[PDB]
Design a protein around this ligand. Structure first.
Ligand code: HEM
Length: 154
């Protein structure tokens, strides 16, 4: 796939708002993922023990990790499609060490979209949401192709 420049603009315009509070958005997203799809929490050995949303909210380590995650994703989106390098180390650790199935990357994509829609309605109307969804599909498709080359296509 290939996004046009007007779509990349809609994606980097709402991402610039996200970057005003990275740790807050990272928290929201990872908690929305764990609540919505609880089986994904089992992949995290560090967080597994969290029982409620209050606990998740209070976890400092969780919040730090949400910053790591959104920082990486942000660096991939700003590439506007030329992310091959950035995608390599990411696909190798999620496919080999963590063992994350594409299916779960779709689940987190849905959590990202849910949270921008709640926090930025004015900058996330239907066209901008279509553009973000297109940018994450692109990401998942390239990751899935990397998975296959690495031997996991999980
Ligand atoms: C937007 C997609 C995602 C991004 C950009 C991303 C990024 C990251 C980064 C940058 C780290 C630290 C370095 C590394 O190990 O590679 C990480 C670690 C991790 N990721 Fe992801 N990730 C994503 C999706 C997921 C999903 C969907 C899961 C599980 C449902 C997952 C599970 C984990 C685990 C198990 C670790 C190790 C956490 C810890 O114990 O340190 N990631 N991820």
């Amino acid at each position: 796939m290939v996004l046009s420049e007007g779509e990349w603009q809609l994606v980097l315009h709402v991402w610039a708002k996200v970057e005003a509070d990275v740790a807050g958005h990272g928290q929201d997203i990872l908690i929305r993922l764990f609540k919505s799809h609880p089986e994904t929490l089992e992949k995290f050995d560090r967080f597994k023990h969290l029982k409620t949303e209050a606990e998740m909210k209070a976890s400092e380590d969780l919040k730090k990790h949400g910053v790591t995650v959104l920082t990486a994703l942000g660096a991939i989106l700003k590439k506007k499609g030329h992310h091959e390098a950035e995608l390599k180390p990411l696909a190798q650790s999620h496919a080999t060490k963590h063992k994350i199935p594409i299916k779960y990357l779709e689940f987190i994509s849905e959590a990202i979209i849910h949270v921008l829609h709640s926090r930025h309605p004015g900058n996330f109307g239907a066209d901008a949401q279509g553009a973000m969804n297109k940018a994450l599909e692109l990401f998942r498709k390239d990751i899935a192709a990397k998975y296959k080359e690495l031997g996991y296509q999980g």
